[PDB]
């Protein structure tokens, strides 16, 4: 194989952490604490029940990632997949990889009757999101989110 | 014990399924498929990694339930807890049970340093959600949800 999308492996840890740092910085202004983030990526790599990373590789080099978590629906007897992140290495942009990754996940959902939907949440201030997702046949839902701020 | 909140057990399957059928009818105008719902509740009861039901019992009679799932955050190295349902048997309403359950889950979140937040999503049409959640210190988030229609 020359180009493929595959499930992440444990030794993708530091590349996935790097990509997530770059993503949070580029998109949300954030400089993530690398100890916290690396722990968080490692915990997800070690527990398939928490979600999954897939990576896009070119002659074995990891150049992009997409991450999703699960929400079990009792009412529907299956999981929604919740897409939480996507990042493409700057050297490999404008080549369709973002869409390859989303379409790969769409196919996973379509081909698994144990997956009942595919969702994500994004900041309302993100100007470009509606058009990006529209292009992928993803449309805005009729829900509001609420949160309680936990403090320890 | 006379009144308590406890984790659900497999014996609670039929009652939790009935409560969820009643909930979906009363709050979303839905008539759930009982074959599918029964399977979905059983699957959740059998796998603590999918989420948890807690039930409110009175002299051993289950009279209410609350259900949550998890969302792992790699950036934060912790879980958000997502409340997916709350239901109180009609013969036990107006006695504070909804809030006992909700506050029980808030306490779980505040006491566990690895829970980073507590969230839910609700239909925009639910005219009473905002006041109900605001009274519990839960406030509307600045996100939109998107979804792909999984073609099954």
Q: Contacts by A124-132 with C-beta closer than 8 Å and gap 24+?
A: A124/B142, A124/B143, A124/B144, A125/B142, A129/B144, A129/B146, A132/A98
Domain B1-101 has CATH 3.40.630.30: yes
Tell me which residue of B74, B75, B7 sits closest to B44, measured CA to CA.
B7
Torsion of CA A138, B127, B117, B3, to 10 degrees: -130
Nearest alpha carbon to residue B139 among A121, A123, A146, A150: A146
Q: Extract the tokens encoding A134.
A: 């529209």
Buried-exposed string A48-84: b where 16+ CB fall within 10 A, e elsewhere: eebbbbbbbbbeeebbbbbbbbbbbbbbbbbbbbbbb
State whether residue B51 is helix, strand or coil.
coil
Residue contact A144–B151, C-beta within 8 A:
no
Question: With contacts defined as CB-CB under 8 Å, which chain B residues touch A145?
Answer: 119-121, 140-141, 143, 145
In three-state secondary structure terms, A62 is strand
Q: What is the CA radius of gyration of chain B?
A: 16
Final resolution, Å: 1.5
A interface mutation test: which of B19, B146, B151 has the most A CBs within 10 A?
B146
A17/B104 Cα distance (integer angstroms): 35
Backbone angles phi, psi at B137, to 5 degrees: 65, 30
| Angle made by CA atoms A7, A119, A23, in degrees to the nearest 5 | 60
Beta strand segments in A14-132, E: 52-58, 61-73, 78-88, 115-123
Helices B13-28 and B34-46 pack at an angle, to 10 degrees, of: 120
Residue B41, CB half-sphere, CA atoms under 13 Å: how many? 26
User: Phi and psi for A74 in degrees, rounded to 5?
Assistant: -65, -40
Enumerate the residues of chain A whose CB falls inside 8 A of the CB of residue B151.
110
- The C-alpha of B63 sits at a distance from chain A's nearest C-alpha, in angstroms, of 19
Question: A117: nearest CA in chain B?
Answer: B150
Q: What is the DSSP letter of B136?
A: T
Say how far apart CA B119 and CA B140 lie, in whole Å. 10
- Determined by which method? X-ray
User: Quick check: A132 and A88 in contact, CB under 8 A?
Assistant: no
For A37-43, the CB contacts below 8 A with 24+ separation are A37/B74, A37/B75, A37/B77, A38/A13, A38/A14, A39/B77, A40/B72, A40/B73, A40/B74, A40/B75, A40/B76, A40/B77, A40/B78, A41/A13, A41/A16, A41/A17, A41/B74, A42/A13, A43/B72, A43/B74, A43/B77
Q: How far is B151 from chain A (nearest CA, A)?
A: 6
- Residues in CB range of A107: below 8 A, 6 or more apart: none
């Amino acid at each position: 194989e020359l180009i493929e999308i595959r499930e992440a492996r444990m030794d993708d840890l530091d590349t996935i952490a790097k990509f997530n740092y770059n993503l949070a910085k580029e998109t949300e202004g954030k400089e993530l604490d690398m100890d916290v983030l690396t722990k968080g990526v490692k915990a997800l790599l070690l527990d398939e029940r928490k979600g999954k990373y897939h990576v896009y590789t070119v002659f074995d080099k990891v150049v992009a990632q997409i991450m999703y978590t699960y929400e079990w629906s009792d009412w529907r007897n299956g999981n929604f997949l919740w897409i939480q992140s996507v990042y493409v290495d700057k050297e490999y942009r404008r080549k369709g990889i973002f869409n390859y990754l989303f379409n790969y996940i769409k196919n996973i959902c379509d081909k698994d009757e144990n997956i009942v939907g595919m969702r994500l949440y994004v900041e309302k201030e993100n100007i470009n999101a509606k058009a990006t997702y529209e292009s992928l046949n993803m449309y805005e839902c009729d829900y509001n989110m609420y949160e309680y701020e936990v403090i320890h």
